[PDB]
Design a protein around this ligand. Structure first.
Ligand SMILES: CNCc1cccc(-c2cccs2)c1
Length: 188
């Protein structure tokens, strides 16, 4: 067939019950995730092609970057709680991987301050149990699928995107194939 298990996607041998519809995982340390987000814009183009009533969830992971990697998962929780993902994603990726100016939790905080989040608001969120709950949700979701590589995208806790079965001679074609596969899987 045109889409086949083991090709554009794989099937989870143990399907995850109650999982978000479209679940993306990434790390601000992850060089391929930088490409996916800053160059290819995977999330946006997927989000874009999604059917109506299909929600998209994106979570950070801990297993890259040690202590700072864990700080970044908490900061992504702050980003989600405040609703400022579209303001901090670019400067977080560039601070970690382009300028390499992000070396501490304080450097992370600087990115939010510069993006216009007030110091008091960041700190209250950072220290909040709402954010601790959001950290826990990110860890649980990754745990549910034995997650050990990023970038990754899962559909309905059953299917895992497989970009390795896609041509990358043209970036735009790769992206739309990826997006159309997510759409196909969400309709499945
Ligand atoms: C794990 N994902 C890696 C991957 C797979 C397919 C294509 C790419 C890229 C194409 C252009 C920049 S990056 C990266």
């Amino acid at each position: 067939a045109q889409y086949e298990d083991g090709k554009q996607y794989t099937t989870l041998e143990k399907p995850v019950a109650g999982a978000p519809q479209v679940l993306e995982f990434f790390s601000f340390f992850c060089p391929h995730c930088y490409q996916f987000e800053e160059v290819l814009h995977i999330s946006d183009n997927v989000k874009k092609k999604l059917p109506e009533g299909v929600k998209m969830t994106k979570y950070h992971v801990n297993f890259m970057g040690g202590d700072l990697g864990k700080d970044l998962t908490q900061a992504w929780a702050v980003a989600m709680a405040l609703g400022v993902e579209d303001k901090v994603t670019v400067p977080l990726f560039e601070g970690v991987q382009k300028t390499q100016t992000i070396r501490s939790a304080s450097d992370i905080r600087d990115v939010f301050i510069n993006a216009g989040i007030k110091g008091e608001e960041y700190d209250a969120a950072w220290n909040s149990f709402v954010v601790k709950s959001l950290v826990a949700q990110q860890e649980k979701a990754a745990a549910d699928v034995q997650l050990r590589g990023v970038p990754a995208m899962f559909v309905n806790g059953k299917y895992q995107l497989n970009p390795q079965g896609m041509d990358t001679s043209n970036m735009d074609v790769f992206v739309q194939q990826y997006a159309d596969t997510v759409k196909y899987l969400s309709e499945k």
